[PDB]
Amino acid sequence: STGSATTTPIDSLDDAYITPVQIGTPAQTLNLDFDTGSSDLWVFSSETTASEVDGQTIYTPSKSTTAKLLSGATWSISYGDGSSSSGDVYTDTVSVGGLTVTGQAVESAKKVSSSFTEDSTIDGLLGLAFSTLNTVSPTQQKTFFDNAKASLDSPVFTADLGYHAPGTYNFGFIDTTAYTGSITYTAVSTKQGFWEWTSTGYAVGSGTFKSTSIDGIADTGTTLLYLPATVVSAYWAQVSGAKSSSSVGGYVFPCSATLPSFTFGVGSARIVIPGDYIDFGPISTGSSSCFGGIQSSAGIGINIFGDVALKAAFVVFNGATTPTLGFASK
Numbered sequence: 442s443t444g445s446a447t448t449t450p451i452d453s454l455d456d457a458y459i460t461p462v463q464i465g466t467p468a469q470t471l472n473l474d475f476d477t478g479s480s481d482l483w484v485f486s487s488e489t490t491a492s493e494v495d496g497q498t499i500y501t502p503s504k505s506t507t508a509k510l511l512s513g514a515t516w517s518i519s520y521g522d523g524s525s526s527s528g529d530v531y532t533d534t535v536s537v538g539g540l541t542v543t544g545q546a547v548e549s550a551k552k553v554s555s556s557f558t559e560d561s562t563i564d565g566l567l568g569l570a571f572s573t574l575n576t577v578s579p580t581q582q583k584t585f586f587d588n589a590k591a592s593l594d595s596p597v598f599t600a601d602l603g604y605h606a607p608g609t610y611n612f613g614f615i616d617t618t619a620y621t622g623s624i625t626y627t628a629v630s631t632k633q634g635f636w637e638w639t640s641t642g643y644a645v646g647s648g649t650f651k652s653t654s655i656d657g658i659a660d661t662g663t664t665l666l667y668l669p670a671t672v673v674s675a676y677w678a679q680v681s682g683a684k685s686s687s688s689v690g691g692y693v694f695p696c697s698a699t700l701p702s703f704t705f706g707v708g709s710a711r712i713v714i715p716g717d718y719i720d721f722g723p724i725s726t727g728s729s730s731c732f733g734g735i736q737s738s739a740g741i742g743i744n745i746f747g748d749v750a751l752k753a754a755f756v757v758f759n760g761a762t763t764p765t766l767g768f769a770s771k
Contacts, residue, residue: 442592443613444540451562463536465505471564476662480574483548484565496561508533516548516576524556540612546582574634596760602752620755620769625710629764638766645676646701657744667738667745692733707768714753
């Protein structure tokens with residue numbers, strides 16, 4: 442089997458992407474944030490504290506003839522951005538782009554943090570990291586991909602995120618029309634439960650490539666590119682007037698600037714992030730200070746190849762017995 446679904450930016454900045462997901466019988470379609478940096482499929486629901494729901498579409502398990510309470514199971518998650526959610530668990534039928542999993546753990550939120558409430562466009566998350574990170578207790582549950590894997594034509598999914606435009610998540614096949622040149626594959630460590638890999642270096646604009654190992658994670662659920670302070674400083678030094686602002690929470694730059702591109706290495710190959718992808722717009726409405734899309738990972742504890750990086754590529758998440766990651770230009 443295979444599946445193919447369009448993923449759409451939630452706003453004009455590509456702050457996140459939503460993908461429609463069918464849950465239950467009859468189908469209830471929710472727009473979920475596919476997150477290769479976590480491993481829980483959780484949804485706003487009829488059980489979510491009413492004051493914490495503001496415009497989201499909810500899953501109502503009592504209206505699904507295939508929903509079953511997973512007795513005794515609870516979940517609770519905290520994300521790198523400080524947001525969180527928790528609740529109980531059902532199993533139900535879940536379909537993405539024509540690919541169906543029966544008995545998928547659907548984690549129903551009883552509580553969500555303010556950042557989730559305030560984002561009316563995201564109805565929940567669909568985790569695509571390794572199932573070892575799943576938070577369901579006392580019986581850990583498998584991701585949608587892990588459940589689908591054996592049935593897929595090939596044990597892979599691909600992320601093809603758009604810049605200010607829709608893109609595609611495919612399951613079970615590689616669309617050879619969706620990228621240019623060849624896909625370069627690179628090793629993955631699953632030791633921390635992430636799609637963790639080592640970039641071979643970087644360049645700023647038309648500058649020379651610096652060969653240096655950068656360990657990080659391919660994370661569709663993180664907006665920006667978080668890299669070591671040395672790398673980030675080298676980038677922003679090429680933008681007149683750019684500076685790190687403790688009050689704002691990262692590098693800012695004059696909105697009048699033209700940003701240089703940023704290249705990262707994948708083996709001997711190179712992915713070029715155009716300068717415009719690095720612009721996240723005014724820090725507040727009407728400001729002439731703009732927020733940068735490349736930020737320091739210092740104090741995150743891990744480098745994160747988030748959407749800013751991934752949307753410059755066609756990315757293969759290869760879930761073979763020994764997982765690997767593939768990147769192509771597009």
